[PDB]
Amino acid sequence: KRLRPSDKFFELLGYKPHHVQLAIHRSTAKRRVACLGRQSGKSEAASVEAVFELFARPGSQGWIIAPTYDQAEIIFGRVVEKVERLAEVFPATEVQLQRRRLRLLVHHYDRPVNAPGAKRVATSEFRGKSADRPDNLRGATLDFVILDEAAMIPFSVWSEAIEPTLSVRDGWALIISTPKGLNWFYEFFLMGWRGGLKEGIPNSGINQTHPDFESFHAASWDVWPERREWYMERRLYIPDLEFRQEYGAEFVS
Ligand SMILES: Nc1ncnc2c1ncn2[C@@H]1O[C@H](COP(=O)(O)OP(=O)(O)O)[C@@H](O)[C@H]1O
Numbered sequence: 108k109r110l111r112p113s114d115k116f117f118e119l120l121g122y123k124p125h126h127v128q129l130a131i132h133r134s135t136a137k138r139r140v141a142c143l144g145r146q147s148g149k150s151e152a153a154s155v156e157a158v159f160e161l162f163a164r165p166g167s168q169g170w171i172i173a174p175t176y177d178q179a180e181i182i183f184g185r186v187v188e189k190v191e192r193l194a195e196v197f198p199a200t201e202v203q204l205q206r207r208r209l210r211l212l213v214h215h216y217d218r219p220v221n222a223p224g225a226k227r228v229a230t231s232e233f234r235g236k237s238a239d240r241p242d243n244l245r246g247a248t249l250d251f252v253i254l255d256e257a258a259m260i261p262f263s264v265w266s267e268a269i270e271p272t273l274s275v276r277d278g279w280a281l282i283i284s285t286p287k288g289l290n291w292f293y294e295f296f297l298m299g300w301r302g303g304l305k306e307g308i309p310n311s312g313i314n315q316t317h318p319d320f321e322s323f324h325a326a327s328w329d330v331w332p333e334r335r336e337w338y339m340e341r342r343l344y345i346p347d348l349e350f351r352q353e354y355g356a357e358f359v360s
């Protein structure tokens with residue numbers, strides 16, 4: 108089996124996923140590739156996936172990798188907030204923060220941590236990592252990785268550093284980004300794209316797929332149709348190709 112977050116888990120986080128987020132979260136594919144527009148909730152979904160593992164699979168170890176250390180810092184902070192809030196309603200957990208290392212542990216016990224005879228059962232681990240510091244990415248064995256703004260991460264970093272961390276455990280990867288042309292993120296996206304011909308996806312509908320891959324595509328106004336006009340105003344003062352790529356989530360060049 109492959110464990111995925113329940114409606115109840117989302118509620119306990121005060122998290123109401125959009126339909127696209129819902130689709131990403133329920134997928135059991137070992138390689139999930141999500142091509143989404145700016146401000147659609149990519150980083151949010153990433154943080155939620157990390158929290159689920161820490162609490163729902165005691166002992167799990169994984170990373171979110173972002174392109175730059177500053178982004179990794181930010182998203183590490185966002186995961187910390189969610190973990191600390193959820194630890195409130197889980198008496199049998201104890202959180203250990205190592206902020207200067209962008210490292211976080213969640214210790215699981217066999218009973219409320221406050222109670223007599225509490226046995227530590229498992230320790231979950233999460234870290235924020237950055238593609239601009241590839242020396243930090245070696246030596247690890249992990250259950251999951253999440254690549255945030257993956258299309259800005261060099262392919263070599265995925266192939267040489269990140270993917271090998273998943274081998275022993277047959278761990279999963281979530282690869283999420285606003286697109287940046289026809290680079291490796293585009294190639295990986297196509298491997299999981301079964302949605303047929305779609306505007307903004309070159310050669311969609313005639314692409315070959317792999318069973319371990321599942322792909323998701325939505326422009327910022329498709330994930331968040333409520334505020335379609337807010338996104339569309341940017342159309343009038345942002346160049347066409349840039350608007351189409353950054354909010355449309357189109358693969359351009
Ligand atoms: N399902 C959601 N419900 C409410 N707010 C959301 C949801 N998803 C994302 N957000 C909020 O929208 C903003 C952008 O999300 P974020 O993940 O940071 O953007 P991006 O997709 O560009 O990474 C944030 O303030 C975030 O809290």
Ligand code: BEF
Pocket residue numbers: 144145146147149150285
């Ligand atoms: F502002 Be989002 F992370 F693209």
Ligand SMILES: [Mg+2]
Pocket residue numbers: 149150151255
């Ligand atoms: Mg983001």
